[PDB]
Amino acid sequence: HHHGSMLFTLNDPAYLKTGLEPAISAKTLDFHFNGHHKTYLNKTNDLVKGTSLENKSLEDVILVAKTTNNAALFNNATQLWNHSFFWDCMAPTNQTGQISPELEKLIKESFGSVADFKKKFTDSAIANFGSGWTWLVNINGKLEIQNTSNAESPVTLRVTPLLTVDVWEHAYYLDHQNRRPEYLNKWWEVVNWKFVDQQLKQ
Amino acid sequence: MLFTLNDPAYLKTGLEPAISAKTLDFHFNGHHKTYLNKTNDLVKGTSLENKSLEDVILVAKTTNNAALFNNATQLWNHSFFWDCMAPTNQTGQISPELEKLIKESFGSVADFKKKFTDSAIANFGSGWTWLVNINGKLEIQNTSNAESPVTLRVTPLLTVDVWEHAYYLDHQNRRPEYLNKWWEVVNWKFVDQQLKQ
Amino acid sequence: MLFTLNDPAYLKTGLEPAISAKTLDFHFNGHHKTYLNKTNDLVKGTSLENKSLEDVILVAKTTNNAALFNNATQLWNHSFFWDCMAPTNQTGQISPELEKLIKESFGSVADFKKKFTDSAIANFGSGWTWLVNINGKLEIQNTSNAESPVTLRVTPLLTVDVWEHAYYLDHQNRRPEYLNKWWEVVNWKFVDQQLKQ
Amino acid sequence: HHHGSMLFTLNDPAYLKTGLEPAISAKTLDFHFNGHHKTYLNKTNDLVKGTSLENKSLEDVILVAKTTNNAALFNNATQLWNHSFFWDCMAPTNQTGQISPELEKLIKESFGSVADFKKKFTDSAIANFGSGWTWLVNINGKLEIQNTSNAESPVTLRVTPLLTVDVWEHAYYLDHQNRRPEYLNKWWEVVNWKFVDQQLKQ
Ligand SMILES: [Fe+2]
Ligand SMILES: [Fe+2]
Ligand SMILES: [Fe+2]
Ligand SMILES: [Fe+2]
């Protein structure tokens, strides 16, 4: 069938060892990336080998898992994608850039103001019960805030994800314990707005 | 501009032996127009006015709006469903490209039909059974109630409706008999056109 | 020993104008007996032999056994459904006890019926709409597919089946008209007995 | 209308300050009980007061939330109950007691052996994806293992809960981070078997 075996791989986030203070500590990123993310990577790779999914791209694996209702594969493959997306969403504070004019317009149009968007994104992330994610998605020029639970993700949907925050407790418990609002508040300072704008141009 | 529907071409003729014109009257003039009315009502006076149905569906899904998602997606599902069928003498045939991908994912066309049929039979409650194209690999997907691959980064090729209203008047609980007769009204040229858009 | 059903006393007469004898023919002899045989098939050769249907349902629910849960609970749901109805001349009345709890919980019987009815209309897809007693406080519950309060620490008082097969032959897409006329067959004697013991 | 208003309350677990080493540290119990459990208690009391659920038992409030699909009420009220049950399920390693011959009888029958039960329960709890709980329940004399998600709980069901472990990440992340198997491994050493026996015989 093939003799060109491939697996998924992960590269260190550039800020892995220095951290994302004051939002996310270097300690948290160690357990988050070397623990959770690599666990999802190894499990996705184990479940796909020796099957018709070997060598398929991660997004094809995610959509096959979703359409065939394969829970174990969906949970690991989509968690593998969500964290890779999550790392691009953030940067050390001095390297975040700013909201582009074009992106600022669509935030105003969909939410009134940038300040209002942040509060509604934050309140939505706080209200997201249990493990999951809160997303900013672009629907053909209209922006929306989406909550998902556990590994569910808009990567499966006909939308463009612009931004996500992880509210699984492992994303913040070492630094913030039960104070998720304090986690989300400081997380705004590490949002990589250069990436959000680049996601908008596609 | 409100969303609108046009009668399926075979509305008065029916799709015997799968679906009678009687059933099509209730299915289109009842259920499908009901979904159309609710959708227009839910969108009227909102920021969703003058947006496509697909945008309306994805807005409903991403914002977890059940009432809007259920009616707008059901509105899309039936329009796709009607396009998937034709009277037995106007079905066309499975294209060489499509047979090729069917054989790849399921071995043979006969095997595909079998598994597709078993999947629709196993689909408990209300819902739909779909054939989708995932970047060159075909898959059979069951969805519940109004759920639909129209939300997903996949291409739907074919669907059969297994809500009981799609078949109860002609077949009552004989859903297997509905599905196997349903194969005779599959609009294969539509399926092939979905593969090559 | 394996589970059994006995014919509803009114199987040949129907519940006109709510449910015809024909609908009852497919509803009982088709679906309900199908759920019975599959429940019987799944518990045969297993540790569930000898256990009551309720134990089987709770075992299926706690172990996430979908096939066993769907069949066994639908098997219970339909039995409870039949006892909830009677021919229009044999429905009995709302007792003073139940009437007090209805207006305590819902304001008036008129507001209750409207809201129970509005609830069943809103119960999207296949499912059931229930009146339940929670230690003296009553509530309206919507469930999907085979889901049921029989698993819960509540006492069920009344249910209407809104699977489309429950009503499609008599009312097709007119679920409100099925519910409107379903009220005339509510075995209000039975609902009051559920309120005791 | 009456003149004896009531509220839900919590008492400190007896081991709150000593901890449950090596399974759960005193620091975790501080955030878990004083943080999470008390937050669930105040939200439950705040949601019911001034309503027709005021002065109703915790179990009645839960079934009303569940039957009427009241998400905010169900999540807080049921989590209030889940943790209270969880604290009774545990005791310091020197005060756990032993499995009674009658409880041992039902375990062997439903699971083959006590060794096989612990593995199944542990494997079930490791596979419980996201936030949730893993339970041992008695169904009219037959025992079963149940996984639930987020706040879901057999307190809603016509069964007797015998034992639960909390697998929300806040239950273990400060002591064990992503090593949930190691948390569950040590958690067996703090299981209060005499509480499990009392649940069976009541
Ligand atoms: Fe994470
Ligand atoms: Fe339909
Ligand atoms: Fe039914
Ligand atoms: Fe907890």
Domain assignments of chain A as residue spans, ordered by start: 1-202
Spell out the residues 6+ positions from residue D50 whose beta carbon is closer than 8 angstroms to its own.
none
D148: amino acid identity, one letter: T
Looking at the complex, report in whole angstroms how far the Cα of residue A15 sits from the nearest Cα belonging to chain B. Answer: 31
Q: Can you state the percent helix, strand and coil of chain B, rounding each to 5?
A: 55, 15, 30
Facing residue for A60 by CB, picked from B47, B59, B134 = B134
Q: What are the C-alpha distances in Å from B73 to residues A128, A167, B44, B80?
A: 25, 29, 17, 11
Decide if C157 contacts C170 (C-beta within 8 A): no
d(CA C109, CA C188): 12
CA of D36 to the centre of ligand 4 (A): 7
Q: Name beta bridge partners: D165.
A: D134
Find, in chain C, the residue whose alpha carbon is nearest to that of B32. C173
Contacts of C76 (CB under 8 A, 6+ apart): C53, C54, C57, C148, C150
The reply to whether A38 touches chain D by the CB within 8 Å rule is no
| CA C88 vs CA C10, C110, C187, D15: distances in Å | 12, 19, 9, 63
Distances (CA, A) of D119 to B47, B136, D139, D175, D196: 54, 42, 20, 22, 17
- CA B119 distance to own-chain centroid: 15
Ligand-binding annotation for B170, yes or no, is no
- DSSP H or E stretch at residue D160: strand D160-166
Residue closest to B187 by CA, chosen among B108, B83, B48: B83
d(CA B168, CA B23): 9
CA distance A110 to chain B (A): 9
Q: d(Cα B36, Cα D172) in Å, to the nearest integer?
A: 50
D11: number of CA atoms within 13 Å, CB side? 5
**Is-contact A170 A31, C-beta < 8 A?**
yes
A161 close to A12: Cβ distance less than 8 angstroms = no
Residues C6, C51: Cα–Cα separation, whole Å? 19
Please provide the DSSP assignment of D31-81 as one string.
IIIIIIIHHHHHHHHHHHTTSTTTT--HHHHHHHHHHTT-HHHHHHHHHHH
Residues 6+ apart with CB under 8 A from C152: C132, D63, D66, D67, D156, D157, D158
Give how far Cα B91 sits from Cα of C49, C78, C145, Å.
50, 41, 34
3-state secondary structure of A3: coil
Tell me the C-alpha distance between A57 and A188, whole Å. Answer: 31
For residues C9 and C44, what is the distance between their CA atoms, to the nearest angstrom?
Answer: 29
> Hey, are the CB atoms on B152 and A156 less than 8 Å from each other?
yes
Q: Do D144 and C51 touch (CB under 8 A)?
A: no
Residues 6+ apart with CB under 8 A from A120: A111, A145
Task: Give the long-range contacts of residues A44-51, CB within 8 A, separation 24 or more.
Answer: A44/A8, A44/A73, A44/A76, A44/A77, A44/A80, A45/A7, A45/A8, A47/A72, A47/A73, A47/A76, A47/A77, A48/A73, A48/A77, A49/A7
Rounded to whole angstroms, how far apart are CA atoms A101 and A160? 18
**Spatial CB neighbours of D47, under 8 Å, sequence gap ≥ 6:** D72, D73, D76, D77
Q: Which two tokens stand for residue B187?
A: 């609009």
CA distance B179 to B171: 10
Nearest to C93 by CA among C109, C116, C117: C109
Is residue C151 within 8 angstroms of chain D, CB to CB? Answer: yes
Strands C127-134 and C137-144: antiparallel
Known binding-site positions of D: 32, 83, 166, 170
- Put simply, the answer to whether B26 touches C126 (Cβ < 8 Å) is no
Does B153 sit within 8 Å of A157, measured CB to CB? yes
Breaks (C-N over 2.5 A) in chain C follow: none
CA D199 to CA D163: how far, in whole Å?
A: 9
Q: Which residues of B touch A77 (CB under 8 A)?
A: none
DSSP bridge partners of B128? B143, B161
CB contact at 8 A, B19 and B185: yes
Binary contact (A68, B141; C-beta < 8 A): yes
What value does the CA radius of gyration of chain D take, rounded to a whole number of Å?
17
Distance A56 CA to ligand 1 centre (A): 24
Dist. CA A149 → ligand 1 center (Å): 12
Pairwise CA distance, residues A190 & A121, whole Å = 15
Which residues, 6 or more positions from D119, have their beta carbon under 8 angstroms from its beta carbon? none
